[PDB]
Every structure is written in structure tokens, then in C-alpha cells.
């Protein structure tokens, strides 16, 4: 058996301090048939809750911990930095070191600007795209998440190609009016969107691999088609690689799929688990950012030495072979979980995009948000509870992939599969 008492107690406290008892909605566990699991430590692929329970971590702080928890190098260098200073509010050399590493590893990024989050990265990218092009409209994709920036908190309007609507209360009046939302992997609706608004489309923002509606790889020609249509109409291509960056492949999703955006939003891995983000791309576009250009973007704690260091030390330990091992781990994971699902009549479909993996509780292929929404969400809710009990910490959402680390072992994968077999059998006997 497994006790979650301290997490129960901690969450009770949390609920009287924060909205939903959390600093981010997903952490409320509202869709997984158990209450939030409070974590206190981790080591490699293992995460430990405040109840001392061990889990094989497939959340990995939602992407940053690509080397697992508390990587020795990363941690010792972090302690070293802490000794010298957390922050200086002045330029540092580590900012240069990560900047150039990011520039050397991310194809489209020639000039980068560090920020405090993916939300800031994308928000700044959208503003950059609009300021650089002198255009108002942004095209995004249904199911893609870019952060809680107002300019991005938008939905599809009434119609096939559509100037959007606000996707939340509090969003500035008519902020969504200059934003188009078409289905992911729907290149034809993109073509239609440009036919109507193309000459005012500042940019197209896309997750080159959707990871916030589950892992949803791009369809053949989808990203290239976005690259072509943006060029044709003079629009910018913004790759939201906050999650895909340094995770899908060594050279990111843009390197993996050989499609080079004008702008790239990064985060997670580049902070090694600390608050971070960045937007970069072509120099002449990035030059428009303050203080060198008119487009204003500041951050007093941006390029934080601790985050720059952790991200630097994380990335240094990643090689092409890391991703080879991810894929091999993903293969066994997919195979083992899929066979388990078959054996117990569990509807399932896996999506693979480079080293990114995730499955849906549906037999129908997930190629967009609509087909992701076809997943058995209640089954996932139940399944999740069973997996946590078997020592597997999954993202408390069906609309998330399985985050792999370099620290995940074959034994971890086997135990994860065995955990799924057990959980699927139980569900099937019901």
C-alpha cells in the first residue's frame, strides 16, 4: 500500500493560500482521481513526495529535468553560483555562455534574449513579430499552448478561418481580434486564414510538436507549409520550442524536422529546472528589441546566473546519443504499454515525435486537438491513480506526454510497463 497523508495535509494548507491551492492549474490534479502529490526531492528518474513515496518521474518538472532530478554536475555548479551571487541586475558572463550555446544548438537562433518564463518568451516573440512586420494579426493553432500572455489567451472565432475571440475573462478588449486560430495539422485552414488576412498576419506561432494537448507530431508537410505560407505573405514563423527545445532532438524540433523558423521561443531545459525562458531568431528581427531597437521588452531578473548556469550545465551533458536513448526508451515504453493495453482491451494510441512520447486513451489517431479530446478522460483519471500507486508519477493530465530523462533506466521502463499492465488489468476487471 501507499500513503499520501502528508500531501493531503499539505494540500489542505495550500488551498487556504493560493487559488486552487496551487501556483499552476494542472498542479491541482483536477482530472486524475487523486489529490495533488507534494514533492520534496528527486534523484535522477526518481521523484519523492513529502510522504517519502518513490516514483518514476515522467513529468520531470514538465520538461526542464531532461537529465533527471538533482544531476550531480548541475547541482554542484548551482551551489558554486549560489556562493558568488544569485543575481546582480548587471550583465554576467554565464548569460553570454548560455546565449552562445543556445545560438550554437538552436538553428534559427542567432540572437537570443533571456526571459523569466515561456509565457514571456512567446509574448515577447508575438510583440517582436508584430513590431518587426508592422502588422497586427497572429495565427496560432487550436490545442497549442504558448503561455498565459493576454495576446495568446485567445480562441477560434465563429467560422473556418477566423479572427479570434478572448479565451479567458480579463483579457483586454479586442486583443484577440488580431489573432487567428485554426486546427493543428490543418494546413488548408492556414491557407484560408492567409487568403483573408495574410498581408496583416505578423506571424504564425506553433508548437512544432504539440505537447500541451498531448504529444501531437506535425503531419507531413505541415511545418514546411507553415514556413512557405509565412514567407509568401511576409509573416514571421515563430516556433514555440519551450517544451520541444532540446527535448525532441539535439537540434530541437526545428532541427529534427528541418524547418527553420524566424523566431524561436525556448525555456525549460535551458533553465535546468529554474525559472527561465528565451526568445531568439534572425539577428535583424531580434535587433528590433530594446535597447538596440524600438520594440520594448525588459526583465530585471532575466538572465539569472543560477538559471543560466543550471541550463548551461544541463545542456552540456546532452549529446545526440541522449536522444537515441530517449527513442529506445520510448520504443520499449510504447511497446510494453501498448501490449498491456491490447491485452486488457484498453483503447490506446501512441504519438512519437523524436524523443517525445505520449499516448491517448483512444484507438483513433490523434492528429489535432479535436482528436485528442476524443480520449477517455475518465479512464485516464482512473489510470493515473493506479500508476501513482505503482510508483509512477505521470503528468496529471491526458493532454501531456511522457517526459523522459537521461536518468531513466531500462528497469524504470520495465517497472513502468508492469505498472501499466497491473493498472490496465484492474481497470479491465471492473
Ligand X SMILES: Cc1ncc(COP(=O)(O)O)c(CN)c1O
User: Which residues are the active-site residues?
Assistant: 145, 240, 268
Q: Answer yes or no whether residue 129 interacts with a second copy by CB under 8 A.
A: yes
User: Burial level of 291, CB count in 10 A (0-12/13-18/19+)?
Assistant: exposed
Q: List the grid coordinates of 88.
A: 546582480
Beta pairing, strands 179-183 & 137-142:
parallel
Q: List the grid coordinates of 316.
A: 552540456
Residue for grid cell 496583416: 200
Neighbours of 24 (CB within 10 A): 10
Q: Determine the angle formed by the axes of helices 320-343 and 410-429, rounding to 10 degrees.
A: 20
Give 67 or 238: the residue with its C-beta nearer to ligand X. Answer: 238
Q: Answer yes or no whether residue 158 interacts with ligand X by CB under 6 A.
A: no
**Residue 257: CB minimum distance to a second copy, A:** 23
User: Burial level of 315, CB count in 10 A (0-12/13-18/19+)?
Assistant: buried
Q: List the grid coordinates of 188.
A: 488548408
**Are the beta carbons of 89 and 220 closer than 8 angstroms?**
no
234-253: contacts with ligand X (CB under 6 A): 240, 242-243
Which of 105, 268, 348, 352 contacts a second copy by CB under 8 A? 268
Which of 5, 158, 159, 291 contacts a second copy by CB under 8 A? 291
122 binds, among a second copy, ligand X, none (CB under 5 to 8 A by kind): ligand X
Which of 2, 41, 324, 328 contacts a second copy by CB under 8 A? 41
Q: What share of the chain is helix, strand, coil (3-state, %, to 5)?
A: 40, 15, 40
**Residue 20: CB minimum distance to a second copy, A:** 4
Any residues with CB less than 8 A from the CB of 178 and at least 6 apart, and which?
136, 137, 138, 163, 200
**Are the beta carbons of 240 and 140 closer than 8 angstroms?**
no
Cα-based angle 296, 154, 197 (whole degrees, multiple of 5) = 80
Measured distance CA(247)–CA(404) in Å, rounded: 9
Q: Answer yes or no whether residue 184 interacts with ligand X by CB under 6 A.
A: no
Q: Answer yes or no whether residue 299 interacts with ligand X by CB under 6 A.
A: yes
Which of 7, 53, 108, 117 contacts ligand X by CB under 6 A? 117
Site string for a second copy, 309-328 (x = CB under 8 A): -x------------------
43-62: contacts with ligand X (CB under 6 A): 62
Q: Answer yes or no whether residue 160 interacts with a second copy by CB under 8 A.
A: no
**Residue 266: CB minimum distance to a second copy, A:** 13
* Helix residue spans in 198-319 (DSSP H): 222-233, 252-256, 283-286, 305-316
Which of 49, 207, 334, 390 contacts ligand X by CB under 6 A? 207
Give 127 or 146: the residue with its C-beta nearer to ligand X. Answer: 146
Site string for a second copy, 347-386 (x = CB under 8 A): ----------------------------------------
Q: Which stretch binds ligand X (CB under 6 A): 141-149, 288-296, 337-345, 410-418?
A: 141-149
**Residue 139: CB minimum distance to a second copy, A:** 14
Q: Answer yes or no whether residue 2 interacts with a second copy by CB under 8 A.
A: no
Question: Under the rule (CB under 6 A), what is the footprint of ligand X?
Answer: 62, 117-119, 122, 145-147, 207, 211-212, 240, 242-243, 267, 298-301
Amino acid at each position: 500500500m501507499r500513503s499520501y497523508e502528508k500531501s493531503k495535509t499539505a494540500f489542505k494548507e495550500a488551498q487556504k493560500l493560493m487559488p486552487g491551492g496551487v501556483n499552476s492549474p494542472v498542479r491541482a490534479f483536477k482530472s486524475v482521481d487523486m489529490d495533488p502529490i507534494f514533492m520534496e526531492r528527486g534523484k535522477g528518474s526518481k521523484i519523492f513526495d513529502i510522504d517519502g513515496n518513490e516514483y518514476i518521474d515522467y513529468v520531470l518538472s514538465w520538461g526542464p529535468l531532461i537529465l533527471g532530478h538533482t544531476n550531480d554536475r548541475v547541482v554542484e555548479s548551482l551551489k558554486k553560483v549560489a556562493e558568488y551571487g544569485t543575481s546582480f541586475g548587471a550583465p554576467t558572463e554565464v548569460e553570454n555562455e548560455l546565449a552562445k550555446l543556445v545560438i550554437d544548438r538552436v538553428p534559427s537562433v542567432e540572437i537570443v534574449r533571456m526571459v523569466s518564463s515561456g509565457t514571456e518568451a512567446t509574448m515577447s516573440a508575438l510583440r517582436l513579430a508584430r513590431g518587426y512586420t508592422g502588422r497586427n494579426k497572429i495565427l496560432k493553432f487550436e490545442g497549442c499552448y504558448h503561455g498565459h500572455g493576454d495576446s495568446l489567451l485567445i480562441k477560434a472565432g465563429s467560422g473556418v478561418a477566423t479572427l479570434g475571440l478572448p479565451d479567458s475573462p480579463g483579457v483586454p478588449e479586442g486583443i484577440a481580434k488580431n489573432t487567428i486560430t485554426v486546427p493543428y495539422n490543418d494546413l488548408e485552414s492556414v491557407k484560408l486564414a492567409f487568403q483573408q488576412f495574410g498581408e496583416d498576419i505578423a506571424g504564425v506561432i506553433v508548437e512544432p510538436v504539440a505537447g500541451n494537448m498531448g504529444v501531437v507530431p506535425p503531419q507531413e508537410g505541415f511545418l514546411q507549409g507553415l514556413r512557405d505560407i509565412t514567407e509568401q505573405y511576409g509573416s514571421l514563423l515563430i516556433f514555440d520550442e519551450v517544451m520541444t527545445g532540446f527535448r525532441v532532438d539535439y537540434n530541437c524540433a526545428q532541427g529534427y524536422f528541418g524547418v527553420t523558423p524566424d523566431l524561436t521561443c525556448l525555456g525549460k531545459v535551458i533553465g535546468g529546472g529554474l525559472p527561465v525562458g528565451a526568445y531568439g531568431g534572425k539577428a535583424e528581427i531580434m535587433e528590433q528589441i530594446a535597447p538596440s531597437g524600438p520594440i520594448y521588452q525588459a526583465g530585471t531578473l532575466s538572465g539569472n546566473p543560477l538559471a543560466m548556469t543550471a541550463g548551461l550545465e544541463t545542456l552540456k551533458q546532452l549529446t545526440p546519443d541522449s536522444y537515441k536513448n530517449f527513442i529506445k526508451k520510448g520504443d520499449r515504453l510504447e511497446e510494453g504499454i501498448s501490449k498491456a493495453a491490447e491485452a486488457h482491451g484498453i483503447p490506446h494510441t501512441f504519438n512519437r515525435a523524436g524523443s517525445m512520447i505520449g499516448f491517448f486513451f483512444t484507438n483513433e489517431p490523434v492528429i489535432n486537438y479535436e482528436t485528442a479530446k476524443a480520449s477517455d478522460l475518465k479512464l485516464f483519471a482512473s489510470y493515473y491513480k493506479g500508476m501513482a500507486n505503482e510508483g509512477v508519477f505521470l503528468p496529471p493530465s491526458q493532454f501531456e506526454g511522457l517526459f523522459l530523462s537521461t536518468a531513466h533506466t531500462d528497469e524504470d521502463i520495465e517497472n513502468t510497463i508492469q505498472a501499466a499492465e497491473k493498472v490496465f488489468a484492474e481497470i479491465s476487471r471492473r
